[PDB]
Structures are given as C-alpha cells and as structure tokens.
Symmetry: C4
Subunit: 259 residues, 4 copies
C-alpha cells in the first residue's frame, strides 16, 4: 500500500504536508528552468576584452549547465517516482502528462550523448526548442490549463475543420494573389507558397506589410481575402468558447457539489 500512498500523494497534493512541499518544489523548479532557458539567450553586454556580445548561456555556460542538470535530475527523479509508484503503469505511461514529462526530460540526455559534436547546429537547436516543453509541466499545477487542454480535446473536430477550411482558403487566395501579383516589379509574390505568407497574414488581420499588393486586382483580392478570413476564422471560435465555458462551469458545479 506504500505505492498507492505515494500515488495518492502525487495525484492529490493537498493531503499531506510532504506531498504539498514536493508539489511546490516541483513547481518552483519548473519555473526556474523555464526562466533560465529564456534568460540564457540574453546578451551579457561586452566582456573585458570581448569583440562582440555573448549570451548569458555562453558567458556562463558552466553555471547554466549546472542549473539545467539540477532541474533535470529533479524532473527525472519525480518522473521515476511517479512511474514505479503508480497502480497501473501502462495507464500512467500512456497518460498525457507522462509524455509531457518524458519530452521535457529526454532532450537533456540526448544532448549528453551528443556531447562529441555540440558546435554543430541542427539537432542542437531542435533540443533547445524542445526544452520549452517543460512549461507544459505547469499543467499539473494549473487547473485552468487542464481546462484548456480538455476543451482543446473536446473541439478536435471543430479545430480540424478550421484547419481544413483555412488550408483551402490559403490555397485559393495564394493562387489568386500570386497570379495577380507575379508581374509586379520586385514582386514578393514569387510563387504560390510565397503567397501563403501574405494570405495567412491577411486573413488573420495581422497586416505586417512586408508583402502588400501593388496591383488593382491584388488590392481587390486582398480585400476579399481579409473579409473571408475573418468569417472563416470566426466559425469555430464560438463553439470553442462555448466548450471552454461549459467545462469551466461544469467543474465549478462539481466543486460546489462536493464542497
């Protein structure tokens, strides 16, 4: 019953004080790792006798490696405790938070086994990006984030239809704008995939202005693109918001029902 006691401590943090302090230590370490990963890209001005600026993670690489390894050992000891001390380990491993934890953890050890070639980019930048998935470990700490996950899973069909309609609108308007605007001088509409960028920026009403139409047909079809993008995007948003509010309200009725 020790394993199920550990499981009820991990799943419910407000049952003991040991579980609560474990919970808050894990939250603090997640925040520290996230902040350190963000900070290490900031330049530390100019060093004494330095030609150019050097990021926090390069001027102090040893300290940042020590911080990252401390956070990663904390994360992996927590994960192994969750694994070896769960009732049904298949259910735990296939549970979403377990994949989140392993995606947070493994990049560090993959970087370790690739220590021979570290100056080379490519896989390096990929692991550096995948280190941000440790912010998804706050889902275990935020109820609203779990609500967001639940309502994203609930509206999978609506999200898929939104993606399909967006894809079709992007193809249509990119084709139209490329063919209307390929002939302009110094045109940025060098292909239909190039016009994908203009179409997606226009339909969302961003308007960066790095690609703007310069032809009368371009103006007309960009206007139609703006309006049609507004209408297409606004189709599943009400359903998504309805599901989000419904999930939140259902949880608040449940809270008042049991308390």
């Amino acid at each position: 019953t020790a394993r199920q006691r550990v499981w009820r401590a991990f799943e419910n943090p407000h049952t003991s004080t040991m579980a609560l302090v474990f919970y808050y230590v894990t939250g603090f370490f997640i925040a520290v790792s996230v902040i350190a990963n963000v900070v290490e890209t900031v330049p530390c001005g100019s060093s004494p006798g330095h030609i150019k600026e050097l990021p926090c993670g390069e001027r102090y690489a040893v300290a940042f490696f020590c911080l990252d390894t401390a956070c990663v050992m904390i994360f992996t000891v927590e994960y192994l405790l969750r694994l070896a001390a769960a009732p049904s380990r298949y259910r735990f491993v296939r549970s979403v938070m377990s994949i989140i934890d392993v995606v947070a953890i493994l990049p560090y050890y993959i970087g370790l086994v690739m220590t021979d070639n570290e100056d080379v980019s490519g896989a390096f930048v990929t692991l550096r990006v995948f280190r941000v998935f440790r912010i998804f470990k706050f889902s275990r700490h935020s109820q609203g984030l779990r609500i967001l996950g639940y309502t994203l899973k609930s509206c999978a069909s609506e999200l898929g239809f939104l993606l399909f309609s967006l894809t079709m609108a992007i193809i249509i308007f990119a084709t139209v704008m490329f063919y209307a605007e390929k002939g302009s001088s110094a045109s940025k509409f060098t292909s239909i995939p190039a016009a994908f960028w203009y179409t997606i920026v226009t339909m969302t009403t961003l308007g960066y202005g790095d690609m703007v139409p310069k032809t009368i047909a371009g103006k007309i079809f960009g206007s139609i693109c703006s309006l049609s993008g507004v209408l297409v995007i606004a189709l599943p948003v009400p359903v998504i918001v309805s599901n989000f509010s419904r999930i939140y309200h259902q949880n608040q009725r449940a809270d008042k029902r049991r308390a």
Copy 2:
C-alpha cells in the same frame, strides 16, 4: 436500373466497395492536381547553365502537363459518368457541383484549343487561376464544406447587406480621407479609388502601413474609420455564426435520429 445503381453509388459512397474506391481515387486525384498546381510555381533553383531560376512547371513542363492531363481525364470521365447515369439530367446539370466540375474541367480544354498562342499572358493567367476551382471538388468529400456552403446560401441576405454597408462606408471614408490627405507631400491618396485601399485595410484592422495618414484630420478620420469598420463588420457575423452552428447541429440531430 443500371443508371440508378450508378447514381446511388456516386451519391452514396459507403454502399459498395467499388463506389468507395472510386470516391477515394477521385479525392486523391483532386489532392494531387491541387498540389501540383501549387508546386509548379516554385523555382527549381538554378539549372546547369541557366541564367535565372525557372519554376517547377517550366523546367519540367512535360511532366506537369502529363500529370494535369491525367487528372483532367479522370475528372471528365467521372463527370460524364455522373451525367449519363443520373435519373434527372437537368437537375444534375443545374446542380451546383456540376457547375463546379465543369469549371474545373473546361480551362484545360480551352487551353488545348488555344495552343497556337500560349506565350501570351492574359487568358493564360485566367485559365491558370481557374484551375484552382478543382479544390471546390473536395466539397463532395467534406461534410463541413457542404455545411459552409449551406450557411453561405442561408445568409445571402445578410451577406448582401454587409456588402452594401461596406460599400457605403468605403465610399464615405475614402472621400473623407482623400480630401483630407490629397495635399500631403508624396501622398498615396491620389484619388478616392486609391483611398478605397486605405479604407478597406483600415476597417478590417489589417494595418499594412503602405498607406498611412500624415495629417491631423487624416489621423482623426482614420481612427473613426477603424472603429466604424469594426462595428459594421461585426453586424452580420453573429447571424452567420448562428446559422452555421444551427446547420451543423441540425445535421448532428439528423445523424443521431437515423443512427
């Protein structure tokens, strides 16, 4: 009864296996033609001994023509099968999907009969644009796309009123902004039709920045244009979304009623 058997196979794909494979082959060929039409505009780097980059559809014109003709023969044999094997051929021909199919098909044969003069643009770029209407043949494959078509037909009056109000707002604010901004140095507000572009970009909250006001009156009226455009655009969107959700929900009650 062979013709009505063919018709029930085409209209309902999940009745046989022959109809299902025909359905999925048509879907695959539609996707292939769409992807090829998008891809052929991409440059293939630099060829050996080539002065400039050449698009995929020009460096490999024969292969792309072969792919396009295979897709078009598939489309036209499917269309002729639908035509000659339908119960009421007037109803089929006047049905929206039939016009969609003929608009997808005919540009290819029109390009064939115009093979004498192909280097000339104009009609060429028009046929190239009209080749994207083959993406509307996925309406026969997507239920949500048919929902979108049904709710666009349902809100025809709301869409027309939106177009009328947008036209009036564009005229008013283009006149105001042109007269406020015609006097600026190197002004892009060279006419009221020129200010149509600024007004439509401003009311949709795009903000490209290729045309921005430089006069105090220009700033004031551009601000009013932004706000009024938000309010005008937001008038029929709730009705359109209500109709879309109502159509989708009606179909989901129908699905649970018959299944």
Copy 3:
C-alpha cells in the same frame, strides 16, 4: 387630398406605378451622383501636350458640372415636392431624412454663391466632402440602412460610454507611451497628442507600424495597450449587435404579421 395622395406616394413607393418610377429614378440619380463624385478624382492619364496628369473632374469640368447640376435639380425638386406636399411640414422638416436631403443639396448652391473665389481651397474641399452625404439618401431606399440607423439611435448610451472609455484609455496610454518613448532617437512620440495616434492604432489592433515603440517600457505598455483596447472595444459591441438583431427580427415578425 392631393397633398396627402402625394405624401402616400412618396412615403410608400409600391402603391402606384408613378410613385415607383419616381422612387427608382431618384435612386438611380443618387447612384449616378455618388459614382460621378468618386470618379472625378481619378486622373485621366496624360492629355496631348499636358505636363502632368489631370483628374476626370478637371479635364472635363463642364461635363461633370452638368451632371452634378442635373442631379442637384432632381434632388431639390424631389425635396420641394416632399416639403410642400406633406401633412405636417414641421414634422417633415425636423425629420432626419429632411436634414439629410438639405445637407446633400445645399453644398451645391453654396458653391454657386462662392463662384467668385473657387481656386482657393478650404471651404471648397469642405463642400466637396459634404457632397458625399448624398449616399445617405440611399437610406430611403435600403431597409437595412434604416435598421442600422435605428440601432445606432437605440445604442446611443452604449456608444457614448464607449467613446468615454476610449477617450480615457487613449489619454492614459498616450501619456504613458509619450513619457516612456520621448527619449528615443528620432522619436515619433513628440507629444501626448502625437501618441494619441499610436494609442488608437494599437488599441484597435491595426498596427500600421508608422509609430512603434523602441524602448522596453514602450514595448510593455504597448502590449498592455493592445490587450486593454481589445477588452474596452469589445464591451459595447455585443449590446450593439443584440440591438441590431433585435430590430431586424422585430421587423421580420412585423412583416410576417401583416403579410
């Protein structure tokens, strides 16, 4: 009873054929005047022996004056018929459409009495702008435009509160952004009224980019400005849309009640 017969012909166009043709002739002339006023600002290329381009209304000033005077005599004979042949002339004159008609008409005669000094701008551009108020005469022809007017009058309090909240947000964020950004090199934030433009462009999510913050405080407060503007603007829009849909639906119940 001749005057009340004329009044019932003008107020209700689908009662006779004379009233209907009068109605449609007035609509056609309103459209023609609007189109001519828009078109006359377009340049007519280069004339034979012309140094620079000349607008349609300057190369063909006599023709455009003839068109404008024909439209204005039509408008004023219609207005005088409405006036002298109405039951209660105080109620007619104070009715909104009467002020719309007089604002459409008078600029022409004011321009006539100012024929001595026409090359001078100022009052000239003001009359040219006020000539666009003839597009509001389509309110007598569009039911949806009357719905829009009714729902704008209905939400006068909500619109006023929106204006007040927008004014306060503009003042606050313009002050904050000016003081954060006055010190930048070549700064466009030369005063708080200058930062009014940045604040109003940011809160509406336009993002022209002609004024962007260059300081860390500027970035932070511009982000807060964007979010707060979204929330502030989104407060009266649901009420306005509710009123618009309610007015439209009330009219559609009335239509089905009496027909």
Copy 4:
C-alpha cells in the same frame, strides 16, 4: 450630525445644490488638470530667437505650475473634507477612491520636496506619468466607469488565467521564433525576450511589421502564433462581457425598482 450631513452630500450629489455645485466644480477641475497635463507636452512652434521648439509646459512653465497647483489644492481640500467628515475613516481610507485620490495628489507634493533637483529625469518622468491617475477621479462622476471597475474586480480570476495563458504562449512562441530566426541576416530576434515583442504583437493581430519572420519555419510558427493568440485571447472575453452586461443590467433593474 454635521459630519454625516457632509458625508451624505459628498456620497450623493443630487441632494442639495451646494453638493451639486461642489460635485460639478470638482469634475470641471479634474477635466482641466487632465487637459493641461496633456497640452503642456505640445510644442509652441518657435519662439522669437529660439533655436528649437519648446513645449507648452516649458515656454509657459509658471502658468502651468499655477494651474496645476490650483487643481491640486482643490483636490486636496476635497480629499481632506472627505476624510475628516466621514463616519468610518478606516473604511474611507481603505476605499479604492481614497487611494485614487492620494495617488492623484501626492506626486505634486513629492515634486515640491524634490525641487532641489528638477532637471534630472527618472523620478521626474515617473511623477509626470503618475499625474494621469487624476483621470481615474472621473470614476466618481461616471457610472459606467464604476461598472467597468466592478466587472474588472468580478473577473479577477478570468483575467489572471488570461495573463497566465498569455505568458505561457508568449514564452513558447518566443522560444520557437527566436531559435527559428536567430540565424537570419540582421535579425531582430536577438534573444527570446526580444521575440516577446514579436509574439505579443502577433497574437493580438497587430502586425506592426517592425519584426517579421524571414525564414520558412519563422513563417509557419508566426502563422500558428497568430491563430493560437486569437483563440487564447478569445477565451475570457465572453465571460468578461457577460459580467459587464450583467452588472449594467442589474443596475438598470435596481434603478427601475427604486424608481
């Protein structure tokens, strides 16, 4: 009972005529101080024998100081009257409007005690910014502003969750965009905190264009950032609007109940 008479005069202005004129004088002085603070940053052209333009508050520093001190003595005499003539002074002092009044008042006296060093910026610009909190004294004059405050307090949890989700989305997309775009030539994505600006401008659909992606991965993730920002921002806005409309309607039922 004199103190409670003063309190009922201050709390309810439409009870006497003395209270009403006091109320409107305070409102007028708040408006005057706000307008003067905005205006003093405007340049007064070029003075006779002046090298450069000088703001209204520097060319006429004595007059603006006199106006500011008159407004501040009015504000502080009103505040001391409210304080010394309230039933429960702890409740008054801890009441929100009291903190608003003291924040409006104190910057002036802090500037007075710092008269020795005034040319130095830093604290000076901070006090100048804090002088705009006198616009929050219109909350005592506007009912809708109090409604906005009440609905902001009501949706504190929703606002906090919006802030948390925005923070996570900003971190994730800033990391992704920095790592995708750090390698571009003359890149503005010099760090993840630098990409905070791009992410917040993109998620709100501003699109300034001062930072735009130049890499294919940058374009893809900027598109995903735009869409995800729209969905994330649109989650608490319906709840906020529901609360705002509910508060306003509750007050309008209360008004019709007691009147």
